[PDB]
Structure formats: C-alpha cells, structure tokens
Chains A and B, each alone.
Chain A
C-alpha cells in the first residue's frame, strides 16, 4: 500500500487481473521487507508451495480474490478522495441539517 513512486506498482493489479493472477494490496512495504530480510520490499509472491501448505493457500487465495480481483472491475469506476476536513464537514453537516428539514 505504500510505494512512493506509486507508479512502480499501480500497473500491478491490472497485470494480475489480466494474467489471471490472484493478488492482494497489503499494508506494509516494511513488513513485506522483513519476510524477505530486506528493509523494505515492495512486492512478494509465491510461485511454489510444499503440498503440506497447498491447502491453506487455496483458502487464502479465495478470500483474497473475493476482496480484490472479483472487485477489480467495480473498483475501476470509483474515484476516491474528495474529503472535507472536520471544521468544514461540521460546517455543512449542520448547515444542511437545519436548512432543508427545519
């Protein structure tokens, strides 16, 4: 979720989506780092797996696809942002409260 040249990584959901690859946007460039013994890491992946684990991984992949891939086409339409700060939220939260419905 960090990465600061976000460009280094913005094409990745699309890529995986295209290549039929299951992916996930994860909190931690640092945490991703430690699992690989670098300071930071940016990405991390499995191509391989011992059959002892195979099972647990299909489970992960499904919850993961549930939240990311499956939702990718819909998330492609939603602009984020456009959020007022609280002094200005409060301003129109109470201005619009009184105004219309007395």
Chain B
C-alpha cells in the first residue's frame, strides 16, 4: 500500500512504519498436496465420469465452450464453477482422447 497521510483520497490514512507479519497456515487451507492429487486422480479413473459429466463433454465437442458453460452453470450452482467444470472436461478430452 503506503498511505498518503491525509484523510481522503486514494491511499487515504495514517502513515505508520510498517511490518508485514508471518504467514498464517490456515490461509493455505485450499492448497493441493501430493497426497490429495494422487487419490483424486486414482479415484477418478476408478469411478469414471457421471451422467451430467458425459452430457457435458459431448456438448463441448459438438457445440462449443459457451453452450457448455451455459448448461454446466444450471447443472451446478453457478457460472464460476461451470467455468471450472468445463475446463476440467476440456482437460479430460485433451489429455485422453488425444495426446
């Protein structure tokens, strides 16, 4: 940051000599991990795609990433996860039924 030192405007506020604290591990609560990558990958190829996930990749190959999202968005909760879900599908498609 660095604050202007006045009480309006862009970096509004008091100039204090700053510190920057040690990072909290909760804050790394989402993070991957080698153990989880492995098990999720394994489980995936064990248990294989689910109905909506099949309708999803054919929708891609046959209609584009935009019809895919629009539907994935209804199927899942939201637009954002729909994005993530299509991307994942893409990466199934590519990594597999290609190279």
A14 interfacial by beta-carbon distance below 8 Å:
yes
Query: In whole Å, how far is B45's beta carbon from the nearest beta carbon of chain A?
Result: 7
The count of residues in chain A whose C-beta lies closer than 8 Å to any C-beta of chain B is: 5
- Interface flags, B40-55, vs A, CB<8A=1, else 0: 0011011000000000
Determine the distance from Cα of A75 to Cα of B97 in the docked complex, in whole angstroms. Answer: 20
Determine the distance from Cα of A8 to Cα of B45 in the docked complex, in whole angstroms. Answer: 17
What secondary structure prevails in chain B residues at the interface with A?
helix
What secondary structure prevails in chain A residues at the interface with B?
helix
Residues of B with C-beta under 8 A to A18: 42
Residues of A with C-beta under 8 A to B46: 10-11, 14
Determine the distance from Cα of A80 to Cα of B36 in the docked complex, in whole angstroms. Answer: 31
For chain A residues 39-72, which have a beta carbon within 8 Å of chain B? none
A-B contact pairs, 9 of them (CB 8 A): A10-B46, A11-B42, A11-B43, A11-B46, A14-B42, A14-B45, A14-B46, A15-B42, A18-B42
Which 9 residue pairs of A and B lie closest in terms of their CB atoms, listed nearest first? A14-B46, A11-B46, A14-B42, A18-B42, A11-B42, A15-B42, A11-B43, A14-B45, A10-B46
